[PDB]
Design a protein around this ligand. Structure first.
Ligand SMILES: CC(C)[C@H](N)C(=O)O
Ligand SMILES: [Cl-]
Ligand code: NA
Length: 219
């Protein structure tokens, strides 16, 4: 059973790695967008950047919000009345960070679907010209996880125990206590008890997140 715990520790690391790497490609595009927007933040120039295929193919949309509440999104969408970019999680998140950040799941203003955002402040000579973001669907994150690995299921949880991505969408943004109340596994311990183990995801900007592996205790 030390042998099981090896395998779960080592699958946990291969999944924590494959996912850190999948995200960091995405993070770099958003950072490049913010860097590019900062070159020339005229709205025509911003729009041209957010329209390019590397962005429109990678994300559901990408956008710029600023402190006077200017907003550009591609693909373009009618936003609900008294939408304000500055109250959105991606904005507040990037505004309270000196690097790029990832949101926890929230409700898209654009599609009304459950999404996460990668966001970063666009800075020209120290000064801020706004916050750039890119949206990934909860289903996209469920798919990437399911594609990227053993003998049970992988899920994504914050250090505070908030379930972020779970193939059981009913559990998304439940805590571990609220999701597993009978016997509540702690992220404090490498292993729990259906044996669940937590690997920290190494080298994400701003966030302390884990891969949970959940298995039926067998094979
Ligand atoms: C639409 C976009 C700006 C972002 N997903 C939001 O919900 O605020
Ligand atoms: Cl526009
Ligand atoms: Na590598």
């Amino acid at each position: 059973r030390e042998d099981l715990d090896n395998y779960l520790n080592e699958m946990g690391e291969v999944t924590a790695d494959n996912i850190q790497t999948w995200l960091s490609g995405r993070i770099l595009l958003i950072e490049n967008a913010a860097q590019n927007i900062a070159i020339n933040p005229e709205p025509a120039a911003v729009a041209s950047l957010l329209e390019q295929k590397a962005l429109t193919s990678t994300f559901m949309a990408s956008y710029l919000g600023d402190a006077t509440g200017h907003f550009t999104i591609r693909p373009d969408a009618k936003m609900p009345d008294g939408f304000d970019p500055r109250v959105r999680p991606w904005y507040k998140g990037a505004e309270s960070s000196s690097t790029s950040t990832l949101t926890e799941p929230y409700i898209d203003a654009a599609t009304g679907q459950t999404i996460i955002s990668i966001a970063t402040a666009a800075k020209k000579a120290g000064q801020s010209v706004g916050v750039v973001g890119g949206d990934l669907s909860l289903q996209t994150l469920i798919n990437t996880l399911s594609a990227r690995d053993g003998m049970g299921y992988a899920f994504l949880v914050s250090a505070d125990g908030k379930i972020l991505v779970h193939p059981d969408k009913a559990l998304v943004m439940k805590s571990l206590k609220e999701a597993y109340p009978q016997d509540t596994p702690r992220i404090s311990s490498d292993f729990s008890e259906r044996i669940v183990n937590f690997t920290p995801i190494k080298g994400l900007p701003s966030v302390n997140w884990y891969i949970g592996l959940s298995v039926d205790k067998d094979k």
